[PDB]
Coordinates of C-alpha atoms in Angstrom, one line a residue:
Chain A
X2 CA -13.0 -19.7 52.1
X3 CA -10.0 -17.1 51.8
X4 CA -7.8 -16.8 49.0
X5 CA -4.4 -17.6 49.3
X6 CA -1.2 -16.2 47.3
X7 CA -0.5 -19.9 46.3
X8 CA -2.5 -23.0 44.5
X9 CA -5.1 -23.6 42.3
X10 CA -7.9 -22.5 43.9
X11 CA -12.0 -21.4 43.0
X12 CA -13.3 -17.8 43.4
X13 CA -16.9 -17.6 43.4
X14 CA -18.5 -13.4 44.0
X15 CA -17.7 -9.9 42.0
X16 CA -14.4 -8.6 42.6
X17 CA -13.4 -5.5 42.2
X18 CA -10.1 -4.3 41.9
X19 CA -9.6 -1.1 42.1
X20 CA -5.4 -1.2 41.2
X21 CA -3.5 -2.5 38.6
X22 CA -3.7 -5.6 37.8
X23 CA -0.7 -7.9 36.4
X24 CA -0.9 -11.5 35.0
X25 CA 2.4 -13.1 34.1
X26 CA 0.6 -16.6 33.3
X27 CA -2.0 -16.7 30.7
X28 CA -5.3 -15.0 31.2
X29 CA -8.4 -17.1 30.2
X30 CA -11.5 -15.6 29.1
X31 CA -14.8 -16.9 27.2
X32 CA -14.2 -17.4 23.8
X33 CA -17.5 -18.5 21.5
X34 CA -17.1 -18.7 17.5
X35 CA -19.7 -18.7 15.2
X36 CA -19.6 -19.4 11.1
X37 CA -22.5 -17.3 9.1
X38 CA -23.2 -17.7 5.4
X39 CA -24.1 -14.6 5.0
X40 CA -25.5 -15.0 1.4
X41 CA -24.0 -14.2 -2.1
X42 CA -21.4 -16.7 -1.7
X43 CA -19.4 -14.6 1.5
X44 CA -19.1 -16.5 4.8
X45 CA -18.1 -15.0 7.6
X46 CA -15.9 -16.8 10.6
X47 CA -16.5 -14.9 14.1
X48 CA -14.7 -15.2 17.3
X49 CA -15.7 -13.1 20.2
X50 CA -14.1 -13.1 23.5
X51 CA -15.1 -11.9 26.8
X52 CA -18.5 -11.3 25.3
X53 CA -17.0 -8.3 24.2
X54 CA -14.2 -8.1 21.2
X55 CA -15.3 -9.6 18.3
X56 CA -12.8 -10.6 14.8
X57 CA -14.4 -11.7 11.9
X58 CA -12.9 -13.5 9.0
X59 CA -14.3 -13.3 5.7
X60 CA -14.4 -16.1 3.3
X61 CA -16.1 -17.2 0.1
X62 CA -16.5 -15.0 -2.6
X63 CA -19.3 -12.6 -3.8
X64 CA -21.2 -12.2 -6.2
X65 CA -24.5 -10.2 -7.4
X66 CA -25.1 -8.1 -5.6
X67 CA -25.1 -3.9 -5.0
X68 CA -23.9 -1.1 -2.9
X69 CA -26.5 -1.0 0.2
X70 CA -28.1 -4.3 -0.5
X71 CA -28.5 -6.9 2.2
X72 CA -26.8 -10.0 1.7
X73 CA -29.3 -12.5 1.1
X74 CA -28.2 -15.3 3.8
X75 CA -28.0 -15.8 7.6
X76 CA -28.4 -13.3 9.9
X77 CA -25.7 -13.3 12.6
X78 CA -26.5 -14.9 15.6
X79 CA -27.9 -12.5 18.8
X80 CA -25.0 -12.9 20.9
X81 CA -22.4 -11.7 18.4
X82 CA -24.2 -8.5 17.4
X83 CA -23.1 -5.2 18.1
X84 CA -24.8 -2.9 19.7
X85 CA -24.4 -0.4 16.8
X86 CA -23.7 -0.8 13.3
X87 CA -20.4 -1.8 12.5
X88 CA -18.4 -1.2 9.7
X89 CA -15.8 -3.7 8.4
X90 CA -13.6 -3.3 5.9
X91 CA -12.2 -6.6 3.5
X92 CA -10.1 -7.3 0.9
X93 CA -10.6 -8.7 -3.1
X94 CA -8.0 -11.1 -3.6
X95 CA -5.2 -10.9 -5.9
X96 CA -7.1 -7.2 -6.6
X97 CA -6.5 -3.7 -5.5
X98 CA -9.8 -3.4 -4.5
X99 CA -11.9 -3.8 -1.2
X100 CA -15.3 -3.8 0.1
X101 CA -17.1 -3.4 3.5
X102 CA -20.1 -4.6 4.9
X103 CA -21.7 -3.0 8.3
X104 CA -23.1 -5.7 10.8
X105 CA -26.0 -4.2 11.6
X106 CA -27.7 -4.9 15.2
X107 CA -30.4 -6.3 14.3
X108 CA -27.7 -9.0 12.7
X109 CA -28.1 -8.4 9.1
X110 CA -25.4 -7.7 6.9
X111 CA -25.4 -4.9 4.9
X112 CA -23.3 -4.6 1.2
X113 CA -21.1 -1.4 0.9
X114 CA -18.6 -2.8 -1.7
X115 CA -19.1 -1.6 -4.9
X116 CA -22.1 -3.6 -7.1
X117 CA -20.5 -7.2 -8.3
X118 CA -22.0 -9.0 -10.5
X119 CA -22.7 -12.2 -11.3
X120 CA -18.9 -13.2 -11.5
X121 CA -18.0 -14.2 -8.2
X122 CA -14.9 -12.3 -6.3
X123 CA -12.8 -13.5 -3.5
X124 CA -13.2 -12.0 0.0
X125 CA -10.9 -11.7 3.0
X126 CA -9.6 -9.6 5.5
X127 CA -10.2 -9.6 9.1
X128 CA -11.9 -6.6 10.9
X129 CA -12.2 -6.5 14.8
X130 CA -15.6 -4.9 16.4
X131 CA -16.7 -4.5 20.1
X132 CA -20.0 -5.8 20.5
X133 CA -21.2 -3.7 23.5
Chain B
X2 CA -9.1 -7.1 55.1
X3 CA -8.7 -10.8 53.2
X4 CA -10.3 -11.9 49.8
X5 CA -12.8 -14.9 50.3
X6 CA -13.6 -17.3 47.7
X7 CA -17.4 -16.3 47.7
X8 CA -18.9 -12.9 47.9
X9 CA -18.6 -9.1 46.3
X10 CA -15.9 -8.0 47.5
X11 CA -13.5 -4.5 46.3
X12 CA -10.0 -5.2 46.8
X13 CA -7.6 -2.3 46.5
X14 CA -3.7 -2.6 45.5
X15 CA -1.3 -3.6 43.1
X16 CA -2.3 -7.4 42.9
X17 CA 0.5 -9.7 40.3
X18 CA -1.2 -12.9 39.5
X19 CA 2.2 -14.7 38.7
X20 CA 1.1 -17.5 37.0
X21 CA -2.3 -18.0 34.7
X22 CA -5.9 -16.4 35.8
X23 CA -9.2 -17.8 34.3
X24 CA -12.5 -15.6 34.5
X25 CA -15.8 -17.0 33.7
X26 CA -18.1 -14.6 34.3
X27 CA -17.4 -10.6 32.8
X28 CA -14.2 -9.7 32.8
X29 CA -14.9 -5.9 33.0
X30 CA -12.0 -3.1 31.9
X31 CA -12.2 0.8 32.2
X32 CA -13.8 2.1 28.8
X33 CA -13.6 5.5 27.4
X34 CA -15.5 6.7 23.9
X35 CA -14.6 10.0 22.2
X36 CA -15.9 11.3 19.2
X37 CA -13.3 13.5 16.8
X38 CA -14.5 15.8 14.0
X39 CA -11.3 15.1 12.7
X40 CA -11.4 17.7 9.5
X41 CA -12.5 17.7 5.8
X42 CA -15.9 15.8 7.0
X43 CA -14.3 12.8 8.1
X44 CA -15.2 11.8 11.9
X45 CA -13.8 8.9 14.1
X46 CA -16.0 7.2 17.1
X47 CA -13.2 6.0 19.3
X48 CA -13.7 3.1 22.1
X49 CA -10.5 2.4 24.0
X50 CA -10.8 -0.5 26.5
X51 CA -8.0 -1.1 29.2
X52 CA -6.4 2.9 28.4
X53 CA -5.0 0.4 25.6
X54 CA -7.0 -1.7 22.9
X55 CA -8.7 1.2 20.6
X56 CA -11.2 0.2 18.1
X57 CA -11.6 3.4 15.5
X58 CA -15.0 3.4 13.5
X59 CA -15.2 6.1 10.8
X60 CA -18.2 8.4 9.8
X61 CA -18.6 10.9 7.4
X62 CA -17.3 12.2 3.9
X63 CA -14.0 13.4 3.0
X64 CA -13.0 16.2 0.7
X65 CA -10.4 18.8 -0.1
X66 CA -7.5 16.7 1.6
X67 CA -4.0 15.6 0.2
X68 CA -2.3 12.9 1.3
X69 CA 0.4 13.6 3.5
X70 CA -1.8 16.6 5.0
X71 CA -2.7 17.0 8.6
X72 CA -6.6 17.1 9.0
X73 CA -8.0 20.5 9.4
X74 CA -9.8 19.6 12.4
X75 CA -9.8 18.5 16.0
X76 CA -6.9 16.8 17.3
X77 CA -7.4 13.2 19.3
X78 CA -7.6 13.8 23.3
X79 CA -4.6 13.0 24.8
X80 CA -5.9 9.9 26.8
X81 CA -6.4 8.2 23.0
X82 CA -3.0 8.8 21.3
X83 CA -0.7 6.1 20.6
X84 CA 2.3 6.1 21.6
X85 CA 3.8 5.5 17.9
X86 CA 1.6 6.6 14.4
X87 CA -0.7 4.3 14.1
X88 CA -1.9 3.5 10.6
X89 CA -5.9 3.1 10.1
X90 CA -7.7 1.8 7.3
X91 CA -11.0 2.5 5.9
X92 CA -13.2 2.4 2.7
X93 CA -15.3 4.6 0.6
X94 CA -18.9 3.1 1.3
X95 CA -20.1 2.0 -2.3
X96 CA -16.9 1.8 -3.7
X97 CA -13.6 -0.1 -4.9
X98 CA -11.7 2.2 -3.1
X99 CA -9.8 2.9 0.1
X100 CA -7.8 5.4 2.5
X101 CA -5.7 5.2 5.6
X102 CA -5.2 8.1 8.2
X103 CA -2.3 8.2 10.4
X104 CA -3.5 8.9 14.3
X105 CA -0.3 10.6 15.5
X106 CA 0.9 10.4 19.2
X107 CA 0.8 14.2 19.1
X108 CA -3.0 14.3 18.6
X109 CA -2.7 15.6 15.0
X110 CA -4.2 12.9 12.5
X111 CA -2.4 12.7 8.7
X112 CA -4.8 11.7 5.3
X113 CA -2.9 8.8 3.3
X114 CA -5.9 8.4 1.2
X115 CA -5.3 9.9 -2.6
X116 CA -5.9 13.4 -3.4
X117 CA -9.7 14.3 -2.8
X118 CA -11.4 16.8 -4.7
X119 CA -14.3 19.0 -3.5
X120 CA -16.7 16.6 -3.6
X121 CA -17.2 14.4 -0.7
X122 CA -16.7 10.9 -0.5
X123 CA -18.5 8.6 2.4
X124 CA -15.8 7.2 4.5
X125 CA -16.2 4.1 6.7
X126 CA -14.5 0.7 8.7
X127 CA -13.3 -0.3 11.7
X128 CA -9.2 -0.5 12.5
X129 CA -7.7 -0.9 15.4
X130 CA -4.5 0.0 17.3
X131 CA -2.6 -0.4 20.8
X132 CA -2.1 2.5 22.8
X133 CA 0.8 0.1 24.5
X134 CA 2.4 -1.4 21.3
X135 CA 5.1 -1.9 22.9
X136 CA 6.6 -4.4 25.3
Chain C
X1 CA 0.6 -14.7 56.4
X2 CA -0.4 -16.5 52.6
X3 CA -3.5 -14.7 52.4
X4 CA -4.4 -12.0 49.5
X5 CA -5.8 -9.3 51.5
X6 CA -8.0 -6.6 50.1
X7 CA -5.2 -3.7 50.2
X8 CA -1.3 -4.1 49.5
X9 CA 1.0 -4.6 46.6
X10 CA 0.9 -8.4 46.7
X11 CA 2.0 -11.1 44.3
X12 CA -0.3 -14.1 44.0
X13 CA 0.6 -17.2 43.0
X14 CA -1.1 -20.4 41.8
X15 CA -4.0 -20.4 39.0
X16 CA -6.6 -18.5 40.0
X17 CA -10.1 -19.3 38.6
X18 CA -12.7 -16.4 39.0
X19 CA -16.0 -18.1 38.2
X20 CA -17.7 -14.9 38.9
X21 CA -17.6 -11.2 37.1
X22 CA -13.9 -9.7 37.5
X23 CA -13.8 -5.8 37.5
X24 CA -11.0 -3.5 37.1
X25 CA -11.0 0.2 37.8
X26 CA -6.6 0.7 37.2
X27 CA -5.0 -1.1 34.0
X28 CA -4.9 -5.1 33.6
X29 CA -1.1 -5.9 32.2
X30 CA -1.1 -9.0 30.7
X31 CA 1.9 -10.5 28.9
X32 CA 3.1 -8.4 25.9
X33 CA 5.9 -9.5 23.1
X34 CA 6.9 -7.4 19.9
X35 CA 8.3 -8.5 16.4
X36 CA 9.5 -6.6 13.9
X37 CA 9.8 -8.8 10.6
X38 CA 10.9 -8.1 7.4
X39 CA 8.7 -10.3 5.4
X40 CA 10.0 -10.0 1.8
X41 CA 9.7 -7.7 -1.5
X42 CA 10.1 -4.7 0.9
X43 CA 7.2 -5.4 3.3
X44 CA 7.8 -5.1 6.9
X45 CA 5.6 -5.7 9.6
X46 CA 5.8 -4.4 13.6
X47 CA 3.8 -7.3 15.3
X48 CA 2.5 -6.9 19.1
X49 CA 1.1 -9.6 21.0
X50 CA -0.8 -9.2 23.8
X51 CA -1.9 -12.0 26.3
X52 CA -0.2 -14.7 24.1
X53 CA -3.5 -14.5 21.4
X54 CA -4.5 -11.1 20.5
X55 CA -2.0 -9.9 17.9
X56 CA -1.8 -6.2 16.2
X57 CA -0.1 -6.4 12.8
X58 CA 1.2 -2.4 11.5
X59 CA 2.6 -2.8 8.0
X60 CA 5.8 -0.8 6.8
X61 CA 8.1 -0.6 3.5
X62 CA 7.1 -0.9 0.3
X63 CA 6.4 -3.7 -1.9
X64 CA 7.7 -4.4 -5.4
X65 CA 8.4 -7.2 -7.7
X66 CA 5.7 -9.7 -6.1
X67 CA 2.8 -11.5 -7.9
X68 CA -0.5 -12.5 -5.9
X69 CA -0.3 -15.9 -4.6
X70 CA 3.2 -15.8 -4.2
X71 CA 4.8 -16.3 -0.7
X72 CA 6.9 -13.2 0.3
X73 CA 10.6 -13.7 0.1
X74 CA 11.9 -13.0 3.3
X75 CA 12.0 -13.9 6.9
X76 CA 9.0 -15.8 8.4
X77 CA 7.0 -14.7 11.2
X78 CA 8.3 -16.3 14.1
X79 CA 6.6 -19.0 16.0
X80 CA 5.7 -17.1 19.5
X81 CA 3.0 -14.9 17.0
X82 CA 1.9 -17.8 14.1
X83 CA -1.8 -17.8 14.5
X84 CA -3.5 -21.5 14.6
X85 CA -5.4 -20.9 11.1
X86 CA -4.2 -18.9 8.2
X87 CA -5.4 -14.5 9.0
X88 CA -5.8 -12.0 6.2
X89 CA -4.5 -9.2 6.8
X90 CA -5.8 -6.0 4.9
X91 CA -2.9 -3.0 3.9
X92 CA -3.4 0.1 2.3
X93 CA -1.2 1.4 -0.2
X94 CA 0.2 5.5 1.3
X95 CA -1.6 8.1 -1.0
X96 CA -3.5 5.8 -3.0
X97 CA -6.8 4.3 -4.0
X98 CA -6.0 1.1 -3.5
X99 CA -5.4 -1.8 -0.6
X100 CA -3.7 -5.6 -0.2
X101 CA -3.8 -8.5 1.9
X102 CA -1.6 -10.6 3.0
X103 CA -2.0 -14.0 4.7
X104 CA 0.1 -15.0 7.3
X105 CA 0.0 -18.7 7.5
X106 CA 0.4 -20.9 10.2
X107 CA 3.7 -21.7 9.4
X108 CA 5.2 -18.3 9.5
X109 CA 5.0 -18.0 5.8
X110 CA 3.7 -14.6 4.4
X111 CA 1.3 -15.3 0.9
X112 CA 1.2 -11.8 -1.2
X113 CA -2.8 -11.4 -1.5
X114 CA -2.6 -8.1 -3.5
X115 CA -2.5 -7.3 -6.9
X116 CA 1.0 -8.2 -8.9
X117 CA 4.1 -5.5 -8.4
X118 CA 6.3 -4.8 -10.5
X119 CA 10.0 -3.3 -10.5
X120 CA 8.7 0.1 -8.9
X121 CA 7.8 0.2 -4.9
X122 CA 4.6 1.3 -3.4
X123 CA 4.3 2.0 0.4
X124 CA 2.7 -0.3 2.5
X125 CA 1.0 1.0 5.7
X126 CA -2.1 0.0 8.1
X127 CA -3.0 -2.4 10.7
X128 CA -4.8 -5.4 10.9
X129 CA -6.1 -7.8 13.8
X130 CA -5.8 -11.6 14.3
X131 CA -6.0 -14.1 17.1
X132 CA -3.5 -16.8 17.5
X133 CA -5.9 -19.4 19.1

């Protein structure tokens, strides 16, 4: 039951270390994804790791609908919201122009592009978030 | 004085893991948060995890600011500055439109939006940056 | 003595597996690799890796003479920091109104996601966030 400084081995308990810490190797740490379709034709692709930092990728397109308006699909699921609203910023493609939308924590999605209507626009752009 | 392979335990020095490390429980790193009233109205809520990863969420409404301007306001604590000008982006909530500040490793923070007027705009997003870009 | 002992510099090998909660007070260095790329029309992007997945893209240069859709004309993203799927990456144009995105495909390749540019150069700045797995 003691750790050794060679071999693959097991460690059960909370460690604590109160130093630095260096890994050379890779370090491994739970990763979850989670696709929402958030309404209005966006989509959203989440990966959160160490139940902690979360990037989403937008996909889809939008259309109608207006500044401070929830989208009108999914929620996002309780383990990837944040504690506090978060505000992430995308991209119209082939345009000049972006949007955002905050995740809010209850998990709804709040509009804060300007107002599109009913012709769709492409949305992309990756935006990072911590969740606690 | 020797790690076991069950139990809390706090283990003290500089411990290199040579090859790969898996955790599957927490992994839990020092955080620090700082708010900056960073001038002309805009603010930033800062989170920097690992005295490293720094997620930047804007607040507020920006006015009377060229670009290419330091902000009128309070500089970044030192424990948050880059160590190279790091290059945010945000948006103007309800709009088309867009802005990116430059967090300088001295503190001082520059507007790269466009010229804004006296009226304020809302200013919002999310962009993050390494404290240790480098390798 | 092949023990790892709760004080003392000490260099472990072997893959360690901590099923529990891991906690540390001092900094966690993982691996770190940078890459500076000039992707084409003017754009340049300073790349840093951490941990072999988490990747910080900070755009430089300016841009001209690029249409959207169009892969960017210079040297592809080398393979140590392709991500699995293609990542948009959102710019910001210094002094202006207006943003881009670029994707950065799994090949390396750079698509131009912004608006068409003509003969005169706008600076590019601004980070953006992907993972590689």
């Amino acid at each position: 039951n003691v750790v050794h400084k060679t071999g693959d081995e097991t460690i059960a308990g909370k460690k604590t270390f109160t130093g630095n810490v260096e890994v050379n190797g890779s370090l491994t740490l739970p990763v979850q994804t989670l696709t929402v379709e958030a309404g209005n034709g966006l989509q959203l692709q989440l990966t959160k790791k160490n139940n902690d930092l979360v990037i989403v990728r937008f996909f889809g397109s939008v259309s109608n609908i207006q500044k401070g308006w929830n989208m009108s699909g999914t929620w996002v699921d309780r383990p990837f919201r944040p504690a506090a609203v978060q505000s992430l910023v995308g991209h119209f493609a082939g345009r000049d122009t972006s949007f955002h939308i905050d995740i809010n924590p209850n998990g709804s999605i709040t509009w804060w592009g300007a107002n599109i209507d009913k012709t769709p626009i492409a949305t992309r752009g990756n935006g990072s978030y911590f969740i606690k």
